[PDB]
């Protein structure tokens, strides 16, 4: 599935809480500070992923490729730009080092391509 974000009351720049409408059995994000209501786009209001399988590829930024302290490799090239040199590194985040996974970011500038073998 996917996460569901904040619905914003735009005119007073505030939060919207989902409350039910019983006249037609629908869900309506209403403001508590003022009177502003929006239809619920989806039935999911709250979701908790407990397995902690988050996209570490999106978590990792591409600026780490130019760091000299990180080791450099040439075994696997960049897929999009074809440059041979990649940087292999770990998660560096908690509750992940139980499985040490390798992430390659291409050292070629202006491509910014990262991938997992």
């Amino acid at each position: 599935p996917g996460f569901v974000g904040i619905r914003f009351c735009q005119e007073c720049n505030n939060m919207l809480y989902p409350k039910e409408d019983k006249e037609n059995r629908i869900l309506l994000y209403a403001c508590r500070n003022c009177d502003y209501q929006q239809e619920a786009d989806n039935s999911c209001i709250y979701v908790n992923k407990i397995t902690h399988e988050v996209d570490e590829l999106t978590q990792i930024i591409a600026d780490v490729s130019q760091d000299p302290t990180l080791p450099r490799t040439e075994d696997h090239p960049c897929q999009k730009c074809g440059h041979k040199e990649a940087v292999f590194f770990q998660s560096h985040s908690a509750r992940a080092e139980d499985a040490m996974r390798l992430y390659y970011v291409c050292t070629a500038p202006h491509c910014g391509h990262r991938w997992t073998e």
Partner: protein, 62 residues
């Protein structure tokens, strides 16, 4: 920073890191001590001048 600490994406800090420890020399120490006791000296000077202005006489600096 607290949210990234709770998530664990950012690693926590260690009190044993000498990068995160500073080392005071005699300079900051003497400056701080002189600051405090110079404030005490100014307190003495102002209460002395206040005593003379209560007495209606001009305060003597020396």
């Amino acid at each position: 920073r607290l949210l990234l600490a709770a998530l664990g994406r950012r690693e926590l800090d260690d009190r044993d890191h000498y990068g995160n420890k500073r080392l005071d020399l005699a300079g900051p120490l003497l400056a701080f001590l002189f600051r405090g006791m110079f404030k005490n000296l100014l307190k003495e000077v102002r209460i002395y001048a206040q005593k003379f202005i209560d007495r209606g006489k001009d305060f003597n600096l020396e």
